[PDB]
Enzyme design. Structure first.
Site, PDB file in Angstrom:
ATOM      1  CG  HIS A 178      -2.283 -84.750  56.428  1.00  0.00           C
ATOM      2  ND1 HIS A 178      -1.940 -86.078  56.556  1.00  0.00           N
ATOM      3  CD2 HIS A 178      -3.365 -84.715  55.616  1.00  0.00           C
ATOM      4  CE1 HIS A 178      -2.789 -86.815  55.859  1.00  0.00           C
ATOM      5  NE2 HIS A 178      -3.663 -86.013  55.281  1.00  0.00           N
ATOM      6  CB  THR A 180       0.510 -88.558  57.840  1.00  0.00           C
ATOM      7  OG1 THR A 180       0.574 -87.426  56.964  1.00  0.00           O
ATOM      8  CG2 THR A 180      -0.609 -89.527  57.388  1.00  0.00           C
ATOM      9  CE  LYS A 181       2.504 -83.993  56.065  1.00  0.00           C
ATOM     10  NZ  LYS A 181       3.429 -84.137  54.916  1.00  0.00           N
ATOM     11  CG  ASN A 182       6.407 -84.652  63.807  1.00  0.00           C
ATOM     12  OD1 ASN A 182       6.433 -84.799  62.580  1.00  0.00           O
ATOM     13  ND2 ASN A 182       7.427 -84.991  64.594  1.00  0.00           N
TER      14      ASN A 182
END
Ligand SMILES: [Cl-]
Ligand SMILES: [Cl-]
Ligand SMILES: [Cl-]
Length: 376
Positions: A178, A180-182
């Protein structure tokens, strides 16, 4: 306005997507899907990496892979994302919540065994903030009781535990891509990692709509047929090309986030040594990935006041999980065993600070100086 997150941008995504569009094959299981899956297999070590539309879908796929049945019990923390629970409830599981540890906000491994019953079938550790749970203890518990272990490693791409890549330790591991992840597969994506070699064939069947299609492409059967209940757990090769651009820069991103993480820690350590706040703990065996930098204030009032203070300085800081067990669906679908010593109390004082690959050193110092002013 300093946001809490901005998706990673490496600068090569467009070129790779254009290349994918030149091939004329954009559906799942394409050239860039293979490249990403082979990279995870080579660098992390799983038996099979399979790209999916989301970590949520990967978790659902794992529950279905494990043939979860109505009434089976699945042990997991209450301090986790809703999808961790949904994936198993969808297969009819009753959820058994277990308190977390204060130092890492991960499930307390010393509490899991007391929650095991003859209906227990799996344990789902969540690696909070990219900091591994105590996996050696958890695997030993699961092996003693013949339970599957499913890592929710949504936050743990590039994290390690005693040198081993998170997501490759349990029988099944799940990644999130997603935005918003790394690392992001163009906004949404996931991966299921099959580490139990005996589960690979079934994983390929349920991912391929319940057919032995992968076995047909291997030349082992004349034709494939519908042989089980399945679903479509496929990422588009357009998104796999976006992801590849990010995975090719995996260490670059990781090192940048870690450096940013350490600037927060250096600057806030004095407030922690004074007892005003609490900083994250990273146990010795854990190689974190700087997925987030959180701090803990005195209580929810202290937390709310700092968030509204930062908001007035045009800094967006956010809290995280509301405990699943005391939500309406959580009281319906699961039970919390043992005492809630830390799940509610610690969730109510945690705030996350702006942290992302492209966060400028100037914007970060603005955040630090606003925090220091609040506590001064
Ligand atoms: Cl087993
Ligand atoms: Cl404190
Ligand atoms: Cl400033």
């Amino acid at each position: 306005m300093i946001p809490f997150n901005a998706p990673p941008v490496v600068g090569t995504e467009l070129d790779y997507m254009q290349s994918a569009m030149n091939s004329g094959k954009l559906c799942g299981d394409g050239g860039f899907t293979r490249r990403c899956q082979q990279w995870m297999e080579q660098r992390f070590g799983t038996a099979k990496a399979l790209l999916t539309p989301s970590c949520t879908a990967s978790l659902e796929m794992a529950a279905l892979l494990l043939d979860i049945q109505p009434g089976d019990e699945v042990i997991m923390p209450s301090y986790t994302f809703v999808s961790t629970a949904n994936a198993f409830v969808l297969r009819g599981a009753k959820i058994v919540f277990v308190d977390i540890r204060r130092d890492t906000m991960n499930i307390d491994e010393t509490l899991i065994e007391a929650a095991i019953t003859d209906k227990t079938r799996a344990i789902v550790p969540v690696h909070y903030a990219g900091v591994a749970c105590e996996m050696d203890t958890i695997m030993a518990i699961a092996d003693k009781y013949n339970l599957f272990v499913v890592e929710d490693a949504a936050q743990g791409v590039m994290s390690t535990y005693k040198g081993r890549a998170l997501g490759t330790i349990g029988h099944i591991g799940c990644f999130s891509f997603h935005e918003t992840k790394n690392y992001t597969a163009g906004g949404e994506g996931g991966a299921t990692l099959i580490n139990d070699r005996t589960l690979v064939e079934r994983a390929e069947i349920i991912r391929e709509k319940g057919t032995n299609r992968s076995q047909f492409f291997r030349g082992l059967v004349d034709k494939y047929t519908w042989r089980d209940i399945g679903s479509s757990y496929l990422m588009s090769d357009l998104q796999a090309a976006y992801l590849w651009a990010q995975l090719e820069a995996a260490e670059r991103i990781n090192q940048q986030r870690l450096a940013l993480w350490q600037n927060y820690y250096d600057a806030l350590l004095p407030l922690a040594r004074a007892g005003r706040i609490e900083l994250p703990t990273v146990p010795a065996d854990c190689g974190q990935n700087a997925h987030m930098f959180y701090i803990k204030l005195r209580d929810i009032e202290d937390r709310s006041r700092l968030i509204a203070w930062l908001k007035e300085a045009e800094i967006l800081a956010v809290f995280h999980y509301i405990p699943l067990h005391s939500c309406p669906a959580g009281e319906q679908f699961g039970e919390f065993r043992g005492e809630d010593r830390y799940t509610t109390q610690e969730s109510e004082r945690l705030v996350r600070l702006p942290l992302f690959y492209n966060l400028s050193v100037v914007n970060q110092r603005t955040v630090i100086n606003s925090l220091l002013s609040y506590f001064s």
